[PDB]
Design a protein around this ligand. Structure first.
Ligand code: HEM
Ligand code: HEM
Ligand SMILES: Nc1cccc(C[C@H]2CNC[C@H]2NCCCO)n1
Ligand SMILES: Nc1cccc(C[C@H]2CNC[C@H]2NCCCO)n1
Ligand SMILES: C[C@H](O)[C@H](O)[C@H]1CNc2nc(N)[nH]c(=O)c2N1
Ligand SMILES: C[C@H](O)[C@H](O)[C@H]1CNc2nc(N)[nH]c(=O)c2N1
Ligand SMILES: [Zn+2]
Lengths: 407, 411
């Protein structure tokens, strides 16, 4: 019941009790661990609403109070009458911040309580969504001094009027399959890019074409919108020592903004809830740039460094990896765009974890995701045992819209 | 039931059915994943089914399932268990068993080599001196002047739990660690407690930074005894860098033989508490962990200084740069001295081929992602992108409590 996690580097042992409040399943059983798998009614709703309202009133030190009870009855009556309910602004803010607090795969949660929440529940059209999103982007970007934020569109009603941002991230580069059989741009976005073209987008067919937004409002067919170019802050990537690096013609956008997840608060489902923070270097330098199925630039960089790529044991891939990541951090820092290196970020997470264990009884964490994709054991989280469980409010994955939308 | 695992780099999807044969628990539940947790005498009653399952697996493996030989063996073991409360494995079963414990070791990235294990049957061993001799022979055979050969030496199984054979060392070869009164540590910090035990037992510690520890061996439940492995049998590699001539002056070296000696080998319900096994190193074990863990030799700073990296801010990735150089050095040195070693790219690439082969020929390959992914350059190795399923199959290697915490001293 009372589990303990140990840090094998510091010997520090923490006891987790928060997991006992876990509701959702993990995908694992006593016979099989699926820890490395990427994707493992009025009657149903009131229980969820109650659990949420209880934690909310408990957070504001008014558990059991009349206000707590009144609200509880108010929501119950509303659910029975309207088959759903509306969160108070205070509840929405608390819920969004906690969905982030509960995101087991997020290493930057020490920042959880500073989330700027934009209530977009009054939005009704795709154009309105576009406006709200540009404001989010401009607000979060803040001329390079990034600020965490989330914009929350109307909650699901009957399932045929869902609001959705079809894009996976607000800002991402297009991908196109060339005759050469090769891929131009971001291979990860080929399918999406074609859906945009299929919709009308005039693809420039460049290596870094900022994709247009495909916004779906009230269950209607999505619409294209181009984020004002001047609102999409990008960073040209250069190395502090290798002058030839700039010649690679590499650049990345400064705002990481996830837009395909579902925010669940008190049983309510917010299918369109784009949120953003700021990058941890490795996300771009290791994953976006070096993943074989992404920009896959290791060989190109290796060649320019004049490394013995004859034998894997010379560790040329590793050396080029470090350089690509040193450049990313350097380029973002030079342009005054917020970014955190994996050492600083993981150190912060350990501190956050410690706080969470002592003030909340635990911190769900997915080791597989928390440990940076490079230099794993030289970051502290590598040596930190973690317990992964699911708490609500939460951010959940949801089916891509183009595989469920009835045009 | 069928479970699928996907490689997010190649889109290749594999299907696992082998997990159905999994009996042991994982530590996880439908509500909590303990995937990153390091460590989440039987009765006649519970033993025969364990013996039967194993023998069924053994006889199927040799295509004699249901044969008269198979049935006679089950009857023989049955009679043996009821009569003696235990039973003895035939040599063939022991070999098959040891090879499978390795094959089933979900935390081992080197399993493509599982079928080539040399098994030394030391079940006739009766004293610590006897154990010493067996271990020396294992070390010499495995080392093979640098052309390392995987091997395992298996001492008598557990009987009543009061006569256990145990190798107290965690690995046959490791360097002493000494806690200085000023709080600092000389040698390998990981072995301070053990080194202290050895000293208490009479070991004359040379107190250097790389002193090969003595073997502390327990035979038949008796108090352990110290033995020094003949130095000429301990192959070591001075670590130098191909381009940095100052690296050698760091005074670093490492032994060539990785030999785990504290695990328990379970075969058909029998428990072999002393089963030292060895293979060859994957560079990162030494270069990343042994050398760069903050709680081990911790050499990142000294190395970073020499390279004169910008150590004022973490964002210069000086630790990451120094890390790669150190690992290049380990691989270079071992290769230059002709001591077998494998780099993490080659090793993980082979593991993926092994895993795919296993899914197809065996219906699965239990693997612990947390352990399989190398401690450096994670995502540039193919295993990072491979979904895996972790479950426990027997025969298997299991952790067991450290002997000094459970041993009843006789004096
Ligand atoms: C302030 C800076 C932040 C940093 C440094 C940070 C860092 C990270 C990193 C490194 C990942 C893994 C990403 C990947 O490998 O794809 C991640 C995942 C995640 N983060 Fe954060 N994060 C931050 C802000 C946010 C915000 C503001 C939220 C929500 C309001 C959030 C929610 C999540 C979620 C749900 C995931 C997992 C997403 C998935 O499964 O694909 N993060 N974060
Ligand atoms: C032939 C070369 C071999 C290589 C390259 C290899 C490599 C590895 C590596 C890198 C690990 C993780 C080590 C760590 O981080 O502590 C590991 C663990 C393991 N290996 Fe292998 N291995 C090999 C041979 C063997 C042999 C011969 C056996 C048994 C017969 C074996 C059994 C295991 C077990 C049981 C584990 C997990 C040990 C633990 O939990 O501490 N390996 N191996
Ligand atoms: N720094 C942050 C903040 C919030 C979310 C993320 C993660 C985003 C940005 N990079 C990969 C993408 N996640 C994709 C997960 C695999 O599909 N990163
Ligand atoms: N190459 C091999 C072969 C078999 C076993 C191992 C693993 C050994 C050698 N390095 C760390 C140690 N395992 C310790 C696990 C953490 O306490 N490594
Ligand atoms: C198969 C495996 O789960 C997959 O490659 C995971 C591993 N860890 C990860 N960790 C983070 N932060 N992000 C990812 O996309 C992944 N991918
Ligand atoms: C806490 C965490 O489980 C621990 O640090 C693990 C992570 N992965 C590992 N992987 C390998 N190969 N070896 C280890 O010792 C570890 N330690
Ligand atoms: Zn699990």
């Amino acid at each position: 019941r009372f589990l303990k996690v140990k840090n094998w580097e510091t010997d520090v042992v923490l006891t987790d009790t928060l997991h006992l409040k876990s509701t959702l399943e993990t995908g694992c059983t006593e016979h099989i661990c699926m820890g490395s798998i990427m994707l493992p009614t009025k009657d149903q709703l009131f229980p969820l609403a109650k659990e949420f309202l209880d934690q909310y009133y408990s957070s504001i030190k008014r558990f059991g109070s009349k206000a707590h009870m009144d609200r509880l009855e108010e929501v119950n009556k509303e659910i029975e009458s309207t088959s759903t309910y509306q969160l108070k602004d205070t509840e929405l803010i608390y819920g969004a911040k906690h969905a982030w607090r509960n995101a087991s795969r997020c290493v930057g949660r020490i920042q959880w309580s500073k989330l700027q929440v934009f209530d977009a529940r009054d939005c009704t059209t795709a154009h309105g969504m576009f406006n709200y999103i540009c404001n989010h982007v401009k607000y979060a970007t803040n001329k390079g001094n990034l600020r965490s934020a989330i914009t929350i569109f109307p909650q699901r009603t009957d399932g045929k009027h869902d609001f959705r941002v079809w894009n996976s991230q607000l800002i991402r580069y297009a991908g196109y399959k060339q005759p050469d059989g090769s891929t131009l741009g971001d291979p990860a976005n080929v399918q999406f890019t074609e859906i945009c073209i299929q919709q009308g987008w005039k693809a420039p067919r460049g290596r870094f074409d900022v994709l247009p937004l495909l916004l779906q409002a009230n269950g209607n067919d999505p619409e294209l919108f181009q984020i004002p170019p001047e609102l999409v802050l990008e960073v040209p990537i250069r190395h502090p020592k290798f002058d030839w690096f700039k010649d690679l013609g590499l650049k990345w956008y400064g705002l990481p903004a996830v837009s395909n997840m579902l925010l669940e608060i008190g049983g309510l489902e917010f299918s369109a809830c784009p949120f953003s923070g700021w990058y941890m270097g490795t996300e771009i330098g290791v994953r976006d740039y070096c993943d074989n199925s992404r920009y896959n630039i290791l060989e190109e960089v290796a060649k320019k460094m004049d490394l013995d790529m004859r034998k894997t044991s010379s560790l040329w891939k590793d050396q080029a990896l470090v350089e690509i990541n040193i450049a990313v951090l350097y380029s973002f820092q030079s342009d005054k765009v917020t970014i955190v290196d994996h050492h600083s970020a993981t150190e912060s997470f350990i501190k956050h974890m410690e706080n969470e264990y002592r003030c909340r009884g635990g911190c769900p964490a997915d080791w597989v995701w928390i440990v940076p994709p490079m230099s794993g054991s030289i970051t502290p989280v590598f040596h930190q045992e973690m317990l992964n469980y699911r708490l609500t409010p939460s951010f959940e994955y949801q089916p891509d819209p183009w595989n469920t939308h009835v045009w």
